[PDB]
């Protein structure tokens, strides 16, 4: 079990040989950190991408000696001590190429290794945030509660949704009303904002659904996301919310797409008033009428807005129907192509010699931030994991590190706190 000393090493070590797209932006952006150039920026970053004052001012925060590092696919973590024992974690977030989309050196997230139920418990608390953990044992007549906060409260979810959505594109496919290889369009009137990459796609590129599924659950990719729910239509991911696992369906209808949940959520408040004052025949004209090329800019969003019902809003016991639900569709599809879409990003590094398959999604919104995973041992025992937190101001929840964090170390504590 590593010392502080063997494992900031091994950290070192790792990071200097990752021969990935991590290891390269991980690599180069240590050496802005490190070192003593707007062309080499310019190249490293996405195209749509002050910053000289911004590495300025992260350098004089150091020397910094990297203590632990994390890539987790386009996601990675560099934990960073600086002078005076004060910890460091710079962030990465890449694109399907590895260009850096989010770059950011913040206080370190601290996250006790978890002992009991009561540890997370009292760990994750804060003031102002209505926060829930739900940890099931899934079994062939019911679920075993291994522990429960909240579950039955309905919360914001924020891409959870898109777990609806990929239950409602493989009813779908089954009927065999779309398939796996038929061609989506990008136009103008489908571009969302991230996460995701297919935004940055020209107008006119030709997709599969394969593909663009893959992103939507892969890289929670937004304009993915709404390719599928525009070739779908509202009718039939929302008629399949009954099915797909969800208690009250109202809560999600009209089901929203991401560009409306950006567009009403952060443009024109009189827009905004409409909505909540509106039944759903008033919300879906509304959204009909404002069917067009966004204007609402990733700049533009701050404002907690997922207590007026923009948003898509379930309970814990949703969520595990509906994880349920996609490992019987994974089940029956024998191409493997749903599974290849789920297990592509487990949302951490996995022990694989544990578990034979994990499933991970995750969601934030302002005011929203969730984790879910699916977990599945070599004997087929699944396990399902929960993590929400609401609140009305966003600095209250943070950038997600903390809540991913928590599941983290109770997946590291698995024998404690799961299977025990
Ligand atoms: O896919 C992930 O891991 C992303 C995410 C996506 C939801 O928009 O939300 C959490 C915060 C973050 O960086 N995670
Ligand atoms: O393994 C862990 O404990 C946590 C972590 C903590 C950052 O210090 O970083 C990676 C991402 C995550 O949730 N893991």
């Given at each position: 079990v590593p010392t502080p000393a063997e494992a900031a090493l091994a950290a070192q070590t790792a990071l200097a040989a990752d021969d990935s797209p991590m290891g390269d932006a991980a690599r180069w952006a240590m050496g802005l950190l490190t070192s003593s150039r707007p062309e080499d920026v310019a190249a490293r970053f996405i195209p749509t991408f002050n910053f000289a004052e911004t590495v300025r001012e992260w350098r004089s925060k150091g020397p910094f000696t990297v203590r632990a590092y994390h890539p987790v696919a386009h996601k990675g973590w560099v934990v960073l001590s600086a002078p005076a024992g004060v910890r460091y974690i710079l962030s990465l977030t890449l694109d399907?190429?590895?260009?850096?989309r989010i770059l950011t050196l913040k206080p370190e997230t601290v996250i006790p290794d978890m002992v009991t139920w009561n540890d997370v418990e009292e760990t994750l608390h804060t003031p102002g945030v209505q926060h829930s953990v739900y940890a099931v044992r899934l079994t062939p007549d019911g679920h075993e509660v291994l522990h429960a906060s909240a579950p039955e409260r309905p919360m914001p979810t924020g891409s959870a949704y898109k777990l609806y959505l990929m239950r409602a594109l493989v009813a779908e496919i089954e009927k065999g009303t779309?398939?796996?290889?038929e061609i989506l369009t990008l136009t103008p009137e489908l571009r969302s904002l991230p996460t995701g990459d297919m935004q940055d796609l020209p107008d006119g590129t030709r997709v599969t659904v394969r593909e663009t599924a893959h992103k939507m659950i892969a890289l929670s990719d937004n304009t993915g996301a709404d390719l599928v729910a525009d070739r779908l239509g509202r009718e039939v991911v929302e008629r399949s919310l009954a099915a797909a696992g969800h208690h009250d369906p109202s809560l999600m209808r009209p089901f929203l797409t991401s560009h409306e949940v950006f567009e009403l959520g952060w443009g024109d408040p009189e827009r905004r008033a409409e909505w909540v004052r509106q039944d759903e025949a008033g919300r879906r004209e509304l959204l009909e009428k404002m069917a067009g090329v966004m204007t609402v800019r990733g700049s533009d969003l701050g404002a907690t807005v997922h207590q007026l019902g923009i948003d898509w809003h379930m309970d814990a016991f949703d969520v595990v129907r509906v994880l349920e639900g996609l490992l019987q569709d994974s089940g029956r599809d024998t191409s493997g192509t749903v599974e290849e879409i789920l297990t592509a990003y487990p949302g951490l590094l996995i022990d694989e010699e544990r578990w034979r398959r994990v499933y991970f999604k995750a969601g934030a919104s302002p005011g929203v931030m969730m984790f879910c995973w699916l977990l599945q041992d070599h004997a087929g025992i699944s396990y399902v994991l929960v993590l929400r937190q609401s609140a009305d101001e966003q600095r209250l929840i943070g950038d997600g590190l903390f809540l991913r964090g928590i599941g983290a170390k109770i997946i590291e504590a698995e024998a404690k706190l799961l299977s025990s």
């Open positions: 399907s190429s590895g260009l850096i779309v398939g796996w290889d």
